Design an enzyme around this catalytic site. Structure first.
Site, PDB file in Angstrom:
ATOM      1  N   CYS E  47       0.173  -3.370  -3.669  1.00  0.00           N
ATOM      2  CA  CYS E  47       1.515  -3.218  -3.116  1.00  0.00           C
ATOM      3  C   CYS E  47       2.369  -4.449  -3.397  1.00  0.00           C
ATOM      4  O   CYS E  47       3.512  -4.337  -3.859  1.00  0.00           O
ATOM      5  CB  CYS E  47       1.428  -2.946  -1.614  1.00  0.00           C
ATOM      6  SG  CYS E  47       0.365  -4.098  -0.707  1.00  0.00           S
ATOM      7  N   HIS E  98       1.162  -4.655   4.339  1.00  0.00           N
ATOM      8  CA  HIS E  98       1.498  -3.722   3.273  1.00  0.00           C
ATOM      9  C   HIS E  98       3.002  -3.747   3.032  1.00  0.00           C
ATOM     10  O   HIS E  98       3.780  -3.857   3.980  1.00  0.00           O
ATOM     11  CB  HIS E  98       1.042  -2.302   3.640  1.00  0.00           C
ATOM     12  CG  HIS E  98       0.819  -1.405   2.462  1.00  0.00           C
ATOM     13  ND1 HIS E  98      -0.080  -1.702   1.460  1.00  0.00           N
ATOM     14  CD2 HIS E  98       1.366  -0.211   2.135  1.00  0.00           C
ATOM     15  CE1 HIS E  98      -0.071  -0.733   0.563  1.00  0.00           C
ATOM     16  NE2 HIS E  98       0.798   0.184   0.948  1.00  0.00           N
ATOM     17  N   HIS E 110       5.862   2.751  -2.815  1.00  0.00           N
ATOM     18  CA  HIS E 110       4.900   1.680  -2.598  1.00  0.00           C
ATOM     19  C   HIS E 110       3.596   2.012  -3.304  1.00  0.00           C
ATOM     20  O   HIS E 110       3.323   3.168  -3.638  1.00  0.00           O
ATOM     21  CB  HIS E 110       4.648   1.449  -1.105  1.00  0.00           C
ATOM     22  CG  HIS E 110       3.927   2.576  -0.435  1.00  0.00           C
ATOM     23  ND1 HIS E 110       2.892   2.373   0.452  1.00  0.00           N
ATOM     24  CD2 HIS E 110       4.089   3.917  -0.523  1.00  0.00           C
ATOM     25  CE1 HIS E 110       2.451   3.541   0.884  1.00  0.00           C
ATOM     26  NE2 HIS E 110       3.159   4.494   0.307  1.00  0.00           N
TER      27      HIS E 110
END
EC number: 3.4.-.-
Lengths: 331, 142, 264, 264, 147
Positions: E47, E98, E110
């Protein structure tokens, strides 16, 4: 513009003869001192005999070849701002040890060159103490933009060269009065010469600004006993250095009554025959030493080139023993 | 000691080169994301050298040669500390031996890499930082 | 009645002038689309605004609008200039257009609030400034403008709301010190000393002095000290940061004081 | 440590902006001779200078010179800008060109004197400024600059020459009051009150404050009071009269003071 | 330097680009790439690396590599006033953090561990439950700061 860098003799030891710090001297010497960076380097020599200073930007672009991106010269105006000039384009291309040979009638840019190498400790200073110029001039035209328009009948106007700045070494000292004292003194330099910056009218005083930032490669400038006594042996082991010392003794004897010369044709013919006989004797001695036939009469020999320089030969010997050290001093 | 400090010549130079980054970014916007292709000069597929050539010809009018090796000898060499936008940045890629990109400022360069095509990349990236060679300036105009 | 901190009045930077010259060159050329024309006109208007050339800025903005009529930022600048000129209804209309083309342009709320506040509609100004405060409550200048609005309604209530706003904030941004002075918590000397402390270069000092002198002028004006207010507003506008709302509306307050002086 | 008079910092007038817009429009067109083009470039540079856009002014002047090289006024402005930039030799040369193309442009002398004064050639500056004084002895600022020059040579002699000049003048122009303060004849309070009296509108007040604050800053600088000098120079530059030599050289003095502060 | 700053400001003023369209270009060029810890290539990406490469190649912002460093970039923003091009931070993952890029209408692109790089909805139960903060880095236009 010849570029013949070959390993001949014992090492790639060459002599570089510079007539002047030309604006194109870097642009023509870069053909000479650039292409040997990856390959094996040697102890080469740079001779600045009878040199005339041309440009300062070129002096810094030429002095950047042996120093990896470092200040070559400091400049100071009448106000007090100090600027260190260095071309920030290029690393030390010629990574070999270097010997600089300089005479007393050398240029000011040549003084800057030799002073940079001496303060960096990367090269060896050999020769005669230089002239001792420490002033930077500006060369400007006297033409305005409106001259052509409203004064067409005028001819070309002159130019001017006036001292704008004063230059100093990175060690803080200057060469405006004290010059540069080399590590290897020559016999013709030991005489007190009545020439230099001191005997020039209105010469500027001496002042030493604070030392610049610079990485010195070993403090061998004040301590050069290794090659010093070796070359003293070499100069005391040959009659050429002795005959030249006799010449300088004749100078030191004649300079007492140098200003008023006496003209008696009898003693003048005497001294003329004395000089001719001494020249013939020295020529016969060097012929016996070298194995060439002896000269007897002046008519067969035309005008030709005499011996170029034994001090270049001593510099080549110095470069040889420097390569000897570099082979015996990697530790 | 603000604006007047810069001389008139420096002022003209600033006005004349203030859009160099903007032109290179125009080329990037029209050309971003194009695939990588060896010996390619089209939007179907292009290489670093061809991208450099097309960029410098279409945004500035400078006709550089085709191969990265010839470009590497073009112009005048420049040091890492003082490199401007529009200068050529050379890496020792080795897939063809060398790699060429166009520096745009802030340790960034636009180039057509073999992995992700034509993109912006950072000089501080480990791969490129480790594999940097020389730099050349070709926009001679100041 | 007090010594004040002073900064070197801001001078146009080299970047501004180089960019303005290049913009003159580019706009002079024909080879550029109409979208690019409106974009460059808006950018040059912004640069003029930052340099205090507000008529040239409004001209470039009006031309960019005559090219592209769907530019909310141009409507925003036009409404700000209408507020400065005192034509408040037109400012209301321009800010309505801003929110119509884009309802997320929250600063339109702030500007319309200031417009209404200088117009006299204190309630609607309170509404807009409260919306702006809701968008970010920790920004001290939002609470300051909300207090300036609410003071025209109920002084005690406004001061209490300001104290509550200050207490519930993180108290991290420097502007809250101004709020503290407004709450009778720090002396003006401590305010000026914290200002001197938080300023790093001349430009940040000019920013601090501009905003702080504007709010101090408003404070001393609320207490009836006309001379101190005039002097503080002059010292604010003297910083030559022409893009700050404090600068513009300090000029506006000086104009209103001159008008009040003229009319007997 | 003293109360001061304050003016509304000067804002660009509408006339200036309409003139600048029309100048942009006219220069945009091709239908213009080279003489008319250089004339308009010089006028637009003058307007930029009056607005404090000195780089743009210098650009327009340089272009007008590249068209017509026989413009003494352009050389005058270029030399002024070289003085402001601190390149004094080039300023000397530019003013030499001014006097070469026209030896009756008397103000050039003053400017070159100021250059030499800020250069350190106090004697040559004295020569030029004394010539300018000879051109009109009743102008108080000519005597003020001559005194500023001579103070670097002999303080007592300079003050006595200034007093003699003041006595020999008609004492009709207001500026002599500054001279009077320089002679220990009127209190600074009396100076500021006479200033308040002689100012009619905000612009005249700004002019008065600019000149007086510059000379007072020079005064307090000569006495060793750095802080008062900096504050007075800032208050001078705050008047936003970018056309006054007092404004330019007040900025210059502030720059020199910052330079002296930076290097330990 | 001076030329560098002037050219950068000029490029910033001239560009009127569309953030959503550029992020979608990056998504189309990068959709379906597998997830790999400490990976910065199309062979495998995380990510944080995806966010860094996206903001570097489409705009020019040199963001740091780790999610922990990225989380401190820019200025925080609230959910009610969230714009396209802002990075949204979730309190999940192998390392606890994240990163995704908000693209409008409660959506964010993402590099998820499940099926690699994809578009997902902010309103999904997993991410709605696992929301942390959100920050804006694509700024509008700030000349002088209010300090």
């Amino acid at each position: 513009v010849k570029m013949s860098v070959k390993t001949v003799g014992k090492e790639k030891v060459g002599v570089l003869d510079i007539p002047g710090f030309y604006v194109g001297l870097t642009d023509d010497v870069k053909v000479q001192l650039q292409k040997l960076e990856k390959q094996n380097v040697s102890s080469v020599i740079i001779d600045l005999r009878s040199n005339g200073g041309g440009a300062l930007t070129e002096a810094v672009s030429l002095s950047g070849l042996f120093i990896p991106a470092g200040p070559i010269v400091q400049v100071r105006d009448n106000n007090g701002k100090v600027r260190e000039d260095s071309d920030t384009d290029g690393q030390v291309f010629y990574k070999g040890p270097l010997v600089v040979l300089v005479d007393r009638f050398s240029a000011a840019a040549s003084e800057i060159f030799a002073a940079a190498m001496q303060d960096y400790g990367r090269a060896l200073v050999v020769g005669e103490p230089t002239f001792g110029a420490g002033t930077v001039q500006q060369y400007r035209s006297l033409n305005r933009i409106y001259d052509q328009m409203l004064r067409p009948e005028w001819p070309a106007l002159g130019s001017v060269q006036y001292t704008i700045q004063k230059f100093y070494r990175v060690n803080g000292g200057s060469t405006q009065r004290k010059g540069v004292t080399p590590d290897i003194i020559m016999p013709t330099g030991n005489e007190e010469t009545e020439t230099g910056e001191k005997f020039e009218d209105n010469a500027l005083p001496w002042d030493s600004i604070d030392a610049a930032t610079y990485v010195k490669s070993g403090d061998l400038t004040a301590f050069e006993p290794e090659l010093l006594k070796e070359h003293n042996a070499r100069i005391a082991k040959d009659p050429e250095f002795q005959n030249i010392m006799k010449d300088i003794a004749r100078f030191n004897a004649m300079k007492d009554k140098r200003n008023i010369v006496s003209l008696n044709y009898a003693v003048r013919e005497k001294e003329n025959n004395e000089d001719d006989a001494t020249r013939l004797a020295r020529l016969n001695e060097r012929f016996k030493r070298e194995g060439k036939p002896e000269l007897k009469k002046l008519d067969d020999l035309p005008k030709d080139y005499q011996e170029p320089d034994p001090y270049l030969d001593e510099t080549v010997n110095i470069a040889l023993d420097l390569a000897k050290l570099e082979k015996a001093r990697p530790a | 000691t603000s604006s007047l400090q810069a001389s008139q010549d420096e002022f003209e130079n600033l006005v004349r080169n203030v859009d160099v980054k903007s032109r290179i970014m125009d080329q990037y916007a029209d050309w971003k994301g194009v695939r990588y292709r060896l010996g390619g000069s089209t939007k179907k597929g292009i290489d670093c050298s061809g991208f450099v050539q097309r960029t410098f010809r279409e945004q500035f009018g400078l006709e550089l040669p085709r191969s990265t090796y010839e470009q590497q000898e073009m112009g005048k060499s420049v040091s890492r500390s003082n490199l401007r936008t529009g200068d050529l940045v050379l890496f020792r890629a080795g897939s063809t031996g060398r790699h060429v990109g166009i520096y745009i400022g802030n340790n960034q360069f636009v180039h057509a890499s073999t992995s992700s095509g034509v993109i912006i990349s950072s000089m501080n990236e480990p791969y490129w930082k480790k594999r940097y060679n020389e730099a050349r300036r070709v926009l001679s105009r100041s | 009645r007090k010594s004040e901190v002073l900064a070197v009045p801001l001078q146009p930077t080299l970047q501004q002038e180089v960019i303005l010259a290049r913009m003159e060159q580019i706009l002079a050329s024909r080879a550029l689309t109409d979208d690019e024309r409106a974009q460059l006109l808006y950018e040059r208007g912004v640069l003029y605004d930052s340099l205090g050339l507000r008529a040239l800025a409004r001209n470039d903005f009006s031309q960019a609008l005559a090219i592209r009529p769907d530019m909310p930022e141009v409507f925003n600048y036009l409404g700000i200039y209408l507020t400065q000129a005192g034509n408040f209804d037109a400012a209301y209309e321009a800010f309505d257009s801003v929110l119509e083309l884009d309802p997320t342009y929250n600063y339109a709320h702030l500007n319309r609030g200031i417009a209404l506040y200088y117009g006299g509609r204190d309630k609607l100004a309170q509404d807009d400034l409260l919306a702006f405060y809701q968008d970010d409550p920790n920004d001290p200048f939002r609470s300051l403008w909300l207090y300036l609005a609410e003071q025209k309604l109920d002084e005690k209530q406004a001061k209490e709301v300001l104290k509550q706003h200050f207490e519930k904030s993180d108290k991290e941004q420097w502007g809250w010190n101004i709020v503290e002075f407004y709450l009778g918590n720090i002396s003006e000397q401590t305010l000026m000393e914290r200002l001197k402390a938080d300023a790093t270069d001349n430009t940040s000092l000019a920013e601090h002095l501009s905003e702080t002198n504007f709010y101090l002028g408003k404070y001393y004006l609320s207490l009836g000290d006309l001379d101190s207010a005039t002097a503080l507003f002059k010292l604010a506008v003297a910083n030559n940061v022409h893009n700050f709302v404090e600068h513009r509306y300090a000029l506006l307050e000086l104009s209103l004081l001159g008008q009040d002086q003229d009319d007997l």
